[PDB]
Amino acid sequence: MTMMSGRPGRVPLQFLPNEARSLPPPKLTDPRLVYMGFLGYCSGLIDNAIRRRPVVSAGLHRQLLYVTSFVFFGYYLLKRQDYMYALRDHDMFAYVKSHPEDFPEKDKKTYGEILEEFHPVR
Amino acid sequence: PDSWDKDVYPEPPRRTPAPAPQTSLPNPVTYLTKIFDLLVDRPVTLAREFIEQQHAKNRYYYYHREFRRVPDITECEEKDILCMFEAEMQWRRDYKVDQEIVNIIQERLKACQQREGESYRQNCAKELEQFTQVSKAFQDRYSDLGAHYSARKCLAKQKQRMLAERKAAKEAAAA
Ligand SMILES: CCCCCCCCCCCCCCCCCC(=O)OC[C@H](COP(=O)([O-])OCC(O)COP(=O)([O-])OC[C@@H](COC(=O)CCCCCCCCCCCCCCCCC)OC(=O)CCCCCCCCCCCCCCCCC)OC(=O)CCCCCCCCCCCCCCCCC
Ligand SMILES: CCCCCCCCCCCCCCCCC[C@@H](O)O[C@H](CO[C@H](O)CCCCCCCCCCCCCCC)COP(=O)(O)OCC[N+](C)(C)C
């Protein structure tokens, strides 16, 4: 079952609709971006170790490129993920607002009027 | 001393008899008591006087913390998390206070039993009565809640007890 495959107004291969520009972009110090940079640094270290080079010192340009590439991809990945979650919430709220019969707000009862069974522990 | 309130921890008026020597022999206990006094109680008193003199030159106060009363668990909606949290905290504080009340009563009882000596079975009837009353009340309020107790379970227990009492009263009325 595909929930969002055919939502009206969806452009086939866009990856970032113009509507997404109305959302605050992720901060450059976002911990998820830092974790992506950590992944890139780990990839650089593993690249050094597999090629039988000094793991920490062998190629600084290669390690920098690894970290930069992972951060660069992660930024747009996070933007798209946040856009999808915003879309989900927007649709949920619109549907609840347009179908009041299926989401009734029934009367609130205080705990002084609700009869709860007591189960002794003994 | 004035360190504690003598109404919360009362004691009898402490009647002690005067010494009535009936022998020409000296009393070794009195001589030993004089020696102990002059040799132990005076240097300790001087050290305490010095320590209190030093303390009086640096005096500061700490205050008992006051807590306001918030709505109970009965005045809270079913899923209202914040009111439930405040009510649960207040209920836990009251549970601690009730435990301390029972502790005070038990201390009274133990002190009475030691103080009255061989007449404790008759001379400590009032403290035993007070402990029985407080124990009955405390037992009704908190016993059988078990681990993972909360204000909601206490309320359920109280409601069950009230329902049973109301049914018993109405059936006795029909008699
Ligand atoms: C959860 C919280 C965060 C944790 C994150 C996850 C864990 C850490 C990250 C993992 C990946 C990172 C490293 C990847 C490359 C490592 C590959 C490697 O071989 O390393 C050797 C390499 C040593 O090589 P060398 O120095 O060139 O010379 C020695 C020779 O190479 C001598 O080498 P040799 O080849 O001749 O020796 C042979 C040896 C060589 O075999 C190995 O070295 C095994 C390494 C395999 C890499 C792990 C696989 C991929 C990552 C998955 C980890 C999963 C973690 C989740 C939990 C599951 C546990 C497995 O093989 C054996 O002896 C067989 C032993 C069998 C044991 C089996 C267990 C292996 C798996 C254990 C993995 C545990 C995690 C990584 C452990 C650390 C590894 C360095 O290690 C290093 O020196 C690099 C490690 C330190 C780099 C980080 C330091 C950062 C800079 C310092 C400043 C910090 C900044 C702080 C900021 C604040 C300002 C102050
Ligand atoms: C084990 C880790 C998995 C990693 C997988 C590969 C990661 C690197 C690959 C890079 C992806 C490049 C693609 C982005 C360029 C533009 C293409 C874009 O237009 O494609 C859109 C689609 O976007 C892509 O799907 C997003 C790709 C991102 C995948 C990463 C998610 C992995 C899950 C979380 C694991 C953490 C990943 C960390 C990565 C380092 C089109 O949307 P649409 O045509 O309408 O959907 C068709 C399918 N439908 C209709 C059936 C739904």
Give the minimum alpha-carbon distance from B69 to chain A in angstroms, rounded to a whole number: 18
End-to-end CA distance of chain A: 50
Please choose, from the candidates A90, A85, A67, A81, the residue with its C-alpha nearest in 3D space to the C-alpha of residue A26: A81
Breaks (C-N over 2.5 A) in chain A follow: none
Contacts of B95 (CB under 8 A, 6+ apart): B142
Structure tokens at A98: 């347009």
Angstrom distance (rounded) from CA B45 to CA B37: 10
Structure tokens at B44: 């300790």
CA proximity to A8, closest of A76, A81, A94, A82: A94
From the list A108, A117, A122, the residue facing B77 with the nearest CB is A108
Tally of CB atoms within 10 A around A122: 6
Dist. CA A80 → ligand 2 center (Å) = 10
Length of chain A counted residue by residue: 122
Query: Is the Cβ atom of A92 under 6 angstroms away from ligand 1?
Result: no
The DSSP result for chain B, as a single string, is -TTS-TTTS-------PPP---SSS--HHHHHHHHHIIIIIHHHHHHHHHHHHHHHTS-----PPP------GGGSBSS-HHHHHHHHHHHHHHHHHHHHHHHHHHHHHHHHHHHHGGGHHHHTHHHHHHHHHHHHHHHHHHTT--SS--HHHHHHHHHHHHHHHHHHHHHHHT-
| Chain B residues with beta carbon closer than 8 angstroms to that of A116 | 152, 155-156, 159
Q: What is the spatial distance between Cα B156 and Cα B137, in angstroms, rounded to a whole number?
A: 17
How far apart are the C-alpha atoms of B67 and B90, rounded to whole Å?
A: 9
What single string gives the DSSP state of each residue in chain A? Answer: --SSTT-TT--TT-SS-GGGGGSPPPPTT-HHHHHHHHHHHHHHHHHHHHTTS-TTTS-HHHHHHHHHHHHHHHHHHHHHHHHHHHHHHHHHHHHHHH-GGGS--PPP-BTTTS--------
* DSSP 8-state symbol, A53: S
Expressed in percent and rounded to 5, the helix, strand and coil fractions of chain A are 55, 0, 45
Asked if B76 and B87 touch (Cβ cutoff 8 Å), the reply is: yes
Among A13, A41, A42, the mutation site with the greatest number of ligand 2 atoms within 8 A of its Cβ is: A13
The response to whether residue A34 sits with its C-beta less than 6 Å from ligand 1 reads: no
Contact predicate B152/A116, CB 8 Å: yes
Nearest chain A CA: its distance from B90 CA (Å): 16
Burial of B17 (0-12, 13-18, 19+ CB in 10 A): exposed
Ligand 1 mutation target, pool A50, A55, A66, most atoms within 8 A of CB: A55
| Token pair of B170 as six digits | 């109405």
Report the alpha-carbon distance of residue A75 to residue A17 in Å, rounded: 16
| Alpha carbons B95 and B74: distance in angstroms, whole number | 17
Q: Do B78 and A116 touch (CB under 8 A)?
A: no
Residues 6+ positions from A80 with CB-CB distance below 8 Å: A15, A16, A20
A109 and A115 Cβ atoms separated by less than 8 Å: no
Q: For Cα atoms A34, A39, A45, give the angle at the middle one, nearest 5 degrees.
A: 125
Q: Which residue has the tokens 């206990």?
A: B29
Percent helix, strand, coil in chain B (nearest 5)? Answer: 65, 0, 35
Residues in B touching A105 (Cβ below 8 Å): none
Pull the structure tokens for residue A70: 């992972």
Give burial (CB, 10 Å; 0-12/13-18/19+) of A51. Answer: exposed
Q: Please work out whether the CB of residue A57 comes within 6 Å of at least one atom of ligand 1.
A: no
Report the structure determination method: cryo-EM
Query: What's the start-to-end Cα distance of chain B, in Å?
Result: 58
Say yes or no for a CB contact (<8 Å) between B146 and A120: yes
CA distances to A40, B89, B163 from B143, in Å: 59, 19, 18
Which among B76, B78, B153 has the least Cβ separation from residue A118? B153
Q: Is the CB of A6 under 6 A from ligand 2?
A: no
Q: Where are the beta strands (DSSP E) in chain A?
A: none
Q: Is B139 exposed, middle or buried (0-12, 13-18, 19+ CB in 10 A)?
A: exposed
- Written as six digits, the tokens of B69 are 């009363």
Are B77 and A109 within 8 A, CB to CB?
A: yes
Q: Is B145 on the interface with A (CB under 8 A)?
A: yes
* Contact: A111, B155; criterion CB under 8 Å: yes
